[PDB]
Design a protein around this motif. Structure first.
Motif, PDB file in Angstrom:
ATOM      1  N   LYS A 108       0.874  -1.162   0.000  1.00  0.00           N
ATOM      2  CA  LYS A 108       0.000   0.000   0.000  1.00  0.00           C
ATOM      3  C   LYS A 108       0.923   1.227   0.000  1.00  0.00           C
ATOM      4  CE  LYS A 108      -3.551   0.299   3.182  1.00  0.00           C
ATOM      5  NZ  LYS A 108      -3.935   0.312   4.630  1.00  0.00           N
ATOM      6  N   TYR A 109       0.756   2.161  -0.967  1.00  0.00           N
ATOM      7  CA  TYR A 109       1.598   3.362  -1.063  1.00  0.00           C
ATOM      8  C   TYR A 109       0.879   4.633  -0.716  1.00  0.00           C
ATOM      9  CZ  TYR A 109       5.162   0.892  -3.972  1.00  0.00           C
ATOM     10  OH  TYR A 109       6.073  -0.004  -4.467  1.00  0.00           O
ATOM     11  N   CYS A 110       1.610   5.602  -0.176  1.00  0.00           N
ATOM     12  CA  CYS A 110       1.072   6.914   0.111  1.00  0.00           C
ATOM     13  C   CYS A 110       1.363   7.796  -1.068  1.00  0.00           C
ATOM     14  CB  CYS A 110       1.646   7.505   1.388  1.00  0.00           C
ATOM     15  SG  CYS A 110       0.757   8.972   1.941  1.00  0.00           S
ATOM     16  N   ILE A 111       0.301   8.443  -1.583  1.00  0.00           N
ATOM     17  CA  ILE A 111       0.351   9.332  -2.748  1.00  0.00           C
ATOM     18  C   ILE A 111       0.094  10.793  -2.353  1.00  0.00           C
ATOM     19  CG2 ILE A 111      -0.014   7.509  -4.443  1.00  0.00           C
ATOM     20  CD1 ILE A 111      -2.824   9.371  -4.426  1.00  0.00           C
TER      21      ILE A 111
ATOM     22  N   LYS B  89      -4.123  10.081   1.078  1.00  0.00           N
ATOM     23  CA  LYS B  89      -4.604   9.257  -0.034  1.00  0.00           C
ATOM     24  C   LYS B  89      -3.509   8.220  -0.274  1.00  0.00           C
ATOM     25  CE  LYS B  89      -7.545  12.609  -2.395  1.00  0.00           C
ATOM     26  NZ  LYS B  89      -7.729  13.619  -3.479  1.00  0.00           N
ATOM     27  N   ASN B  90      -3.934   6.993  -0.496  1.00  0.00           N
ATOM     28  CA  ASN B  90      -3.037   5.863  -0.624  1.00  0.00           C
ATOM     29  C   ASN B  90      -3.582   4.903  -1.667  1.00  0.00           C
ATOM     30  OD1 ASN B  90      -4.578   3.516   0.925  1.00  0.00           O
ATOM     31  ND2 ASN B  90      -4.749   5.310   2.294  1.00  0.00           N
TER      32      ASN B  90
ATOM     33  N   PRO C  84       8.994   5.131  -6.217  1.00  0.00           N
ATOM     34  CA  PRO C  84       9.597   6.032  -5.215  1.00  0.00           C
ATOM     35  C   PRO C  84       8.570   6.707  -4.284  1.00  0.00           C
ATOM     36  CG  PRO C  84       9.382   7.158  -7.303  1.00  0.00           C
ATOM     37  CD  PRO C  84       9.043   5.722  -7.568  1.00  0.00           C
ATOM     38  N   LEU C  85       7.824   5.921  -3.486  1.00  0.00           N
ATOM     39  CA  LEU C  85       6.804   6.486  -2.594  1.00  0.00           C
ATOM     40  C   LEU C  85       6.785   5.832  -1.212  1.00  0.00           C
ATOM     41  CD1 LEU C  85       3.817   6.559  -5.144  1.00  0.00           C
ATOM     42  CD2 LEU C  85       5.078   8.591  -4.374  1.00  0.00           C
ATOM     43  N   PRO C  86       6.262   6.487  -0.135  1.00  0.00           N
ATOM     44  CA  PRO C  86       6.194   5.799   1.170  1.00  0.00           C
ATOM     45  C   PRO C  86       5.252   4.597   1.096  1.00  0.00           C
ATOM     46  CG  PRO C  86       5.934   8.209   1.397  1.00  0.00           C
ATOM     47  CD  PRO C  86       5.694   7.849  -0.036  1.00  0.00           C
ATOM     48  N   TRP C  87       5.599   3.468   1.722  1.00  0.00           N
ATOM     49  CA  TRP C  87       4.776   2.269   1.646  1.00  0.00           C
ATOM     50  C   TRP C  87       4.649   1.503   2.948  1.00  0.00           C
ATOM     51  CZ3 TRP C  87       6.935  -2.664   2.285  1.00  0.00           C
ATOM     52  CH2 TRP C  87       8.336  -2.701   2.291  1.00  0.00           C
ATOM     53  N   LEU C  88       3.759   0.530   2.934  1.00  0.00           N
ATOM     54  CA  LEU C  88       3.464  -0.320   4.052  1.00  0.00           C
ATOM     55  C   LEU C  88       3.264  -1.691   3.481  1.00  0.00           C
ATOM     56  CD1 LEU C  88       0.899   1.524   6.393  1.00  0.00           C
ATOM     57  CD2 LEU C  88       3.296   1.035   6.767  1.00  0.00           C
ATOM     58  N   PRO C  89       3.715  -2.763   4.196  1.00  0.00           N
ATOM     59  CA  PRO C  89       3.503  -4.120   3.670  1.00  0.00           C
ATOM     60  C   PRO C  89       2.022  -4.507   3.725  1.00  0.00           C
ATOM     61  CG  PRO C  89       5.291  -4.039   5.291  1.00  0.00           C
ATOM     62  CD  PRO C  89       4.476  -2.808   5.463  1.00  0.00           C
ATOM     63  N   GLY C  90       1.640  -5.446   2.862  1.00  0.00           N
ATOM     64  CA  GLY C  90       0.267  -5.927   2.788  1.00  0.00           C
ATOM     65  C   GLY C  90      -0.300  -6.208   4.157  1.00  0.00           C
ATOM     66  N   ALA C  91       0.417  -7.079   4.895  1.00  0.00           N
ATOM     67  CA  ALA C  91       0.135  -7.533   6.259  1.00  0.00           C
ATOM     68  C   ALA C  91      -0.337  -6.424   7.210  1.00  0.00           C
ATOM     69  CB  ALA C  91       1.360  -8.235   6.832  1.00  0.00           C
ATOM     70  N   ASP C  92       0.286  -5.224   7.138  1.00  0.00           N
ATOM     71  CA  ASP C  92      -0.032  -4.105   8.020  1.00  0.00           C
ATOM     72  C   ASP C  92      -1.435  -3.582   7.872  1.00  0.00           C
ATOM     73  OD1 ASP C  92       1.230  -2.078  10.092  1.00  0.00           O
ATOM     74  OD2 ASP C  92       0.021  -0.919   8.669  1.00  0.00           O
TER      75      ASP C  92
ATOM     76  N   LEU D  93       5.916  16.978  -0.340  1.00  0.00           N
ATOM     77  CA  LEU D  93       6.222  17.028  -1.761  1.00  0.00           C
ATOM     78  C   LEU D  93       5.022  17.133  -2.716  1.00  0.00           C
ATOM     79  CD1 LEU D  93       9.537  15.204  -2.316  1.00  0.00           C
ATOM     80  CD2 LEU D  93       8.398  16.284  -4.302  1.00  0.00           C
ATOM     81  N   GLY D  94       3.803  17.235  -2.199  1.00  0.00           N
ATOM     82  CA  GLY D  94       2.635  17.429  -3.057  1.00  0.00           C
ATOM     83  C   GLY D  94       2.072  16.167  -3.672  1.00  0.00           C
ATOM     84  N   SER D  95       0.718  16.124  -3.768  1.00  0.00           N
ATOM     85  CA  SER D  95      -0.038  14.990  -4.255  1.00  0.00           C
ATOM     86  C   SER D  95       0.485  14.412  -5.528  1.00  0.00           C
ATOM     87  CB  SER D  95      -1.515  15.304  -4.386  1.00  0.00           C
ATOM     88  OG  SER D  95      -2.230  14.091  -4.578  1.00  0.00           O
ATOM     89  N   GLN D  96       0.613  13.089  -5.531  1.00  0.00           N
ATOM     90  CA  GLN D  96       1.114  12.260  -6.625  1.00  0.00           C
ATOM     91  C   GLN D  96      -0.040  11.550  -7.369  1.00  0.00           C
ATOM     92  OE1 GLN D  96       4.393  13.945  -6.331  1.00  0.00           O
ATOM     93  NE2 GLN D  96       4.535  12.139  -7.705  1.00  0.00           N
ATOM     94  N   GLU D  97      -1.297  11.952  -7.082  1.00  0.00           N
ATOM     95  CA  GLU D  97      -2.487  11.320  -7.655  1.00  0.00           C
ATOM     96  C   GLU D  97      -2.534  11.401  -9.175  1.00  0.00           C
ATOM     97  OE1 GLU D  97      -6.346  12.904  -6.556  1.00  0.00           O
ATOM     98  OE2 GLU D  97      -7.214  10.869  -6.521  1.00  0.00           O
TER      99      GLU D  97
END
Ligand SMILES: *[C@@H]1O[C@H](CO[C@@H]2O[C@@H](C)[C@@H](O)[C@@H](O)[C@@H]2O)[C@@H](O[C@@H]2O[C@H](CO)[C@@H](O)[C@H](O)[C@H]2NC(C)=O)[C@H](O)[C@H]1NC(C)=O
Ligand SMILES: *[C@@H]1O[C@H](CO)[C@@H](O[C@@H]2O[C@H](CO)[C@@H](O)[C@H](O)[C@H]2NC(C)=O)[C@H](O)[C@H]1NC(C)=O
Length: 391
Positions: free
Chosen positions: A58-61, A123-124, A215-223, A251-255
């Motif tokens: 899961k990535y943060c956008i 938003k992720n 190149p974005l902040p992420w979390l493993p599936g499990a979390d 750094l501003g929305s990556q959507e």
């Protein structure tokens, strides 16, 4: 009879005698299949679905930095520290500022600074693991039985629903009155190394390697905690250009950035796990039989329930009610030249039959180019309708 009304429709005719016919089912597409002395069938792919997919990552956008806190030290007074350094929800950075008399220090030099801020994702986007094994298809087979409502009946009640699983690829559905049709489907578009990336109400199918290297902040599936993100650094920036202060910037929305990156990619319509997406099948019609090939010919008179309507493919549809007594019986049907001498055009709803006088019948036929006579029934009360199909 579902296909009647659908513009993206194919009329697949099997070389008569043959025990198989090859069709390509896809979303937003209908298929009409015919064979000599075999019933005309309508096929649609209703839904494509993934049975329990594993959330890969899961990535943060879009992010938000709050609770900005700074601790400083005068030169020679040591290195500063905040608890936030331990707290995983915060992103910290140590730096050096100019210290001295006019900013509180007895000595003049480089005083150590530390800035922490709370990383909040706004938003992720989840990317669920797909295996071709757990991929299910939903096909609806509707025979051309003239059933009063069947014409473009979206509901589905009229047709036999069937599930094609890569574990049970060969399925034999028993059609009430026509026998069995064995269906042999092959999955086409690889899905092994494919991630089904879900954005909002938008979703796509994308490469496993492409996804994993974002190149974005992420979390493993499990979390399922959803508090502290790996790589926050990809959306966070610390600025200290004049050794006067340390500034923390989002750094501003990556959507929209993501949507543009996903241009070349396989877009899929999605709703509650179901991907309303090129599934190629083989049809066994040897076990299929015409309902009423041994019934006698209707002798009575017919009434015109619904006026002749032309479909987008030049074909015509007629809804008629039987007023005779012989039922169940074969409705007599013919398309001839104006001089009622030449048999012309063909019948899509092959071997039209009456089951009950009360229940009207729907007949689809292909008229010839130009003038013809649509003759339904037998004399007296023989219906002699006139048609024109311009070039
Ligand atoms: C689409 O089909 C539905 C229902 O399917 C049929 O219902 C029976 C009448 C019978 O023909 C079944 O074999 C089919 O499964 C239609 O709804 C029916 O509407 C009529 C009145 O017009 C009513 O007498 C029925 O009871 C309704 N059926 C149910 C179960 O509610 C519907 O009108 C069709 N829509 C179109 C646009 O064709
Ligand atoms: C981020 O800052 C806010 C203050 O702006 C912190 O919330 C305050 O403190 C406690 C909770 O720790 C609340 O009971 C207060 O009502 C809050 N005050 C205000 C003015 O909102 C919040 O705790 C900080 N974040 C973290 C994770 O420490």
């Amino acid at each position: 009879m579902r296909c009647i009304g659908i513009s993206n429709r194919d009329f697949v005719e099997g070389v008569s005698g043959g025990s198989w016919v090859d069709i390509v089912l896809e979303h937003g597409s209908c298929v009409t299949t015919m064979a000599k002395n075999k019933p005309t069938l309508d096929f649609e792919l209703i839904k494509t679905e993934a049975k329990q997919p594993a959330t890969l990552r899961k990535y943060c956008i879009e992010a938000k930095l709050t609770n900005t806190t700074t601790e400083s030290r005068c030169p020679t007074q040591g290195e500063p520290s905040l608890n936030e350094e331990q707290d995983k929800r915060f992103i910290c950075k140590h730096s050096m500022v100019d210290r001295g008399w006019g900013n509180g220090c007895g000595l003049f030099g480089k005083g150590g600074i530390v800035t922490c801020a709370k990383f909040t994702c706004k938003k992720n986007m989840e990317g669920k693991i797909v295996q071709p094994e757990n991929l299910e298809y939903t096909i609806v087979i509707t025979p051309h039985s003239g059933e009063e409502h069947a014409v473009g009946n979206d509901t589905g009640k009229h047709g036999k629903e069937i599930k094609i699983t890569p574990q049970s690829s060969t399925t034999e559905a028993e059609l009430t009155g026509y026998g069995t049709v064995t269906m042999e489907c092959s999955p086409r578009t690889d899905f092994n190394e494919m991630v089904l990336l879900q954005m909002e109400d938008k979703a796509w199918l994308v490469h496993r390697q492409w996804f994993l290297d974002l190149p974005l902040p992420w979390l493993p599936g499990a979390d399922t905690q959803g508090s502290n993100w790996i790589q926050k650094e990809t959306l966070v920036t610390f600025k200290n250009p004049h050794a006067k202060k340390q500034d923390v910037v989002v750094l501003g929305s990556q959507e929209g950035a993501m949507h543009t990156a996903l241009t070349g990619a396989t877009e899929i319509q999605m709703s509650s796990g179901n991907l309303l997406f090129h599934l190629k099948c083989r049809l066994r019609m040897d076990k299929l039989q015409l309902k009423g090939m041994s019934y006698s010919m209707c002798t009575g008179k017919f009434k015109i329930v619904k006026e002749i309507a032309e479909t987008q493919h030049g074909t015509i549809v007629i809804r008629v009610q039987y007023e005779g007594d012989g039922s169940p019986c074969k409705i007599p049907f013919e398309i001839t030249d104006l001089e009622k001498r030449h048999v012309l055009g063909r019948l899509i709803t092959v071997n039209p039959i009456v089951t009950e006088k009360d229940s009207p019948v729907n007949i689809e036929a292909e008229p010839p180019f130009g003038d013809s006579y649509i003759i339904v029934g037998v004399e007296p009360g023989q219906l002699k309708l006139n048609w024109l199909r311009p070039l």
